Design a protein around this ligand. Structure first.
Ligand SMILES: Cc1ncc(COP(=O)(O)O)c(CN)c1O
Ligand SMILES: Cc1ncc(COP(=O)(O)O)c(CN)c1O
Lengths: 453, 453
């Protein structure tokens, strides 16, 4: 990847010691938290920050975070996209506070459901919606409905996808091109040959071959892959994807959990995609676990034919989906505030300006230092990969990832006041991001790469 | 069931007309919401309230709810247990408001994680915890870890369980005693013969026969079944369950999502159970979708051997579980407030007194009217069933449920200012419930049954 991995190790060791010296109170907190949390924090992923422990946060507002050692950071991680519009958005926090004081979960709708439903239909151009407690659940429940309406069992996913803890998606290609369980993800009693057909992104011949078996209920995909570095769709790919799925009467599910960074109506709204189902995760509810999914008129009619509107005195049933806190008053209050006051044309304009500045700065550094790396941007989200050209598919992109280089870069920036999500080589801008924050990121990255070369 | 179903239908029809006359603004809201929500509300379950639409709530506090038609209710539904300690608990609402203003989701811990981890271990007597966004997910993830640590693929569940949208659990016995997909729940590409062994509750011989196959990773169960009416464990059942699972080296997972009504340490704490894993849902976080799960040190050691603590520079991985907003600052703030200020010995003392009064009143009515029905209480939760004696298992209990009778009773009470969850014949008391509220419930139920007989 253009770096001497021995030099990377040397710097990494120095930065691990620097981390220890700078963050003693977080380290002390980690010692205590390891006594009661299985992986030393409430979520096991939090153990994967670089350095010897995750930081304990004291407070965060906008794109600023302060830890319990008093260190201040510019935050380009933004809760690993869960806080994509910034921390403590005043309208959203106020809406949450107000609604908590007048009922957070009633198993009933409130007036906010009226406004939000209409807004979803307007913004995203699909007529009918439902709410879940996570993007994973939206994907799981949509897949269930697709199996119900189609009578087919398999889902098509793309190599190196991520769609949440959707067991049927947890596959990859081995060296012989065989579909096997994803590395480090136990098959969990699933026999994926019975549930899943795997294809590389940007491969219409392979997609046609998968669908031709006639056992595929749905294709599930991001419109632009974001969970193995960034893989843009090729020229003509979306047209072909949409045509092939129509020809085979297969549902097309577009997951915009990350690609909502492309604009106020997502990638689908910018590019005239025609999803059968549309999934969007928790950036919309201010840190309250949430997601929405929507469907076309044609899919709604098919769903109602297999699951009719409930009749008075009918036996109660969940039908295998929904959840007890799904669609609750608190979620809907936060969504209303977010769509009305946060996800505006002006917000996206600001985010794009700063993200374009950040992208251009990274690109200048890579070009100056002659690194065989590249940088890609989708709206507010910028990510680099350790290969010369944009990957044609997820398989290619996976080979350009390296845990040591990533950890070293991330830690070097963390120790100097910039937080990047540990799971990607990405930076996310929000309405509270400032030009000086981009300048700091740019300088530190140039400094780090400079020390390595 | 002791009632003429024809008289039940006649009253139900009258009460549906009464509902229309009393709730015109909710009906208008439903017409609008049907334009944009697939099932006319954010969650399809909300369509299953009795009456011709779900009520739209204006505000709720304690055990009081006011709808948009200005109708006031005593709430014994409490968000179908999601708000089991009452609506708008001041400490919890304040904690949510405070934390929203200083970062809701950071992919990092805060000082509240220290306090909550220690509190969970103290309260529930298991040392190691994790947080999810739902009880469903806690169950799914525990099952995954059990398959990983055991190398076995099957889970034992009990007939007429409910553990959330856990696909492997969605089975029942047919008339021939065959394990088949649960009625109305599509198998969803799961071949349950490969994932699941089904047994009736309170049947140690059948449980032994299931476990003897040597392919069971875990037994998943409520300690007292609450999702098919109430099924108490028989004398000696828990001792036998614990002994058999130990002998076969099978994980025992106790799901207290509802049975937390038994006391501040759940049924397990009251009755000295010894779970390997313990699951508790969203009642603990004030309407923020949440759950916790805990495990013994012995299970933790087996898990760490198959999923080691993360090493510096290791390739990032979700490992098939966790979630982006799981274990977030907002959840942990709400949990801290709930455990410190709400789920106290004094709160439960009040809840028990009022629930005992409610139980005694229901029992008196059933005995006076000579109905072949009975009532059961577990702590704050009271439920009746349309059979003479307590059911020995879920199979028996299922036969004593009737959608029409349930809808009629629920609607009669709703039209006279008492909300009961539409999915059960249950009432839940909280710290804000008053004796006069219980008296109103008691009178209306007696009035309704009186009109029917
Ligand atoms: C594209 C995509 N879809 C779905 C999910 C699942 O989201 P969650 O972890 O909130 O369920 C993620 C994770 N952010 C994602 O990146
Ligand atoms: C015993 C039990 N376990 C798990 C769940 C799942 O909870 P959720 O719908 O919040 O995932 C439920 C639903 N109340 C339940 O009753």
């Amino acid at each position: 990847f253009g770096l001497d991995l021995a030099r990377v190790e040397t710097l990494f060791k120095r930065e691990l010691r620097r981390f220890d010296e700078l963050h003693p109170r977080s380290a002390q907190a980690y010692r205590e938290n390891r006594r009661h949390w299985l992986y030393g924090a409430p979520l096991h992923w939090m153990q994967q920050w670089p350095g010897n422990c995750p930081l304990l946060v004291k407070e965060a507002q906008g794109a600023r975070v302060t830890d319990i050692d008093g260190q201040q950071y510019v935050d380009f991680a933004l809760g690993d996209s869960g806080a994509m519009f910034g921390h403590a958005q005043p309208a959203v926090a106020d809406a949450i506070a107000r609604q908590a004081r007048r009922g957070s979960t009633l198993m009933l709708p409130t007036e906010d459901s009226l406004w939000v439903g209409a807004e979803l239909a307007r913004r995203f151009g699909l007529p009918y919606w439902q709410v879940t407690t996570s993007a994973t659940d939206a994907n799981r429940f949509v897949l269930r409905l697709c199996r119900m309406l189609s009578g087919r069992d398999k889902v098509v996913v793309f190599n190196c996808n991520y769609h949440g803890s959707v067991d049927e998606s947890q596959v990859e290609f081995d060296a012989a091109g065989r579909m096997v369980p994803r590395a480090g993800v136990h098959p969990n009693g699933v026999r994926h040959a019975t549930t899943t057909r795997l294809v590389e992104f940007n491969d219409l011949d392979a997609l046609e071959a998968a669908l031709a078996h006639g056992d595929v209920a749905a294709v599930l995909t991001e419109p632009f892959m974001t969970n193995v570095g960034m893989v843009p769709p090729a020229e003509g790919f979306h047209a072909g994807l949409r045509e092939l799925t129509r020809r085979h009467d297969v549902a097309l599910i577009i997951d915009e959990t990350h690609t909502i960074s492309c604009g106020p109506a997502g990638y689908s709204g910018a590019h005239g995609l025609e999803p059968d189902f549309f999934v969007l995760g928790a950036c919309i509810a201010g840190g309250i676990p949430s997601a929405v999914w929507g469907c076309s008129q044609a899919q709604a009619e098919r769903i109602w034919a297999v699951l009719p509107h409930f009749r008075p005195g009918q036996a109660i049933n969940h039908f295998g989906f929904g959840g007890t806190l799904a669609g609750n008053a608190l979620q809907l209050a936060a969504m209303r505030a977010t769509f009305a006051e946060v996800m505006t044309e002006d917000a996206y304009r600001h985010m794009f300006q700063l993200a374009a500045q950040l992208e251009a700065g990274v690109r200048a550094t890579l070009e100056e230092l002659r690194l065989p790396w590249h940088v890609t941007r989708i709206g507010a989200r910028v990510e680099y990969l350790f290969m010369t050209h944009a990957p044609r598919n997820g398989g290619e992109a996976h080979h350009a990832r390296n845990g040591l280089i990533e950890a070293c870069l991330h830690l070097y920036l963390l120790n100097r006041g910039v937080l990047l999500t540990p799971f990607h080589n990405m930076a996310l801008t929000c309405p509270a991001t400032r030009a000086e924050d981009v300048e700091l990121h740019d300088r530190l990255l140039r400094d780090c790469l400079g020390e390595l070369l």
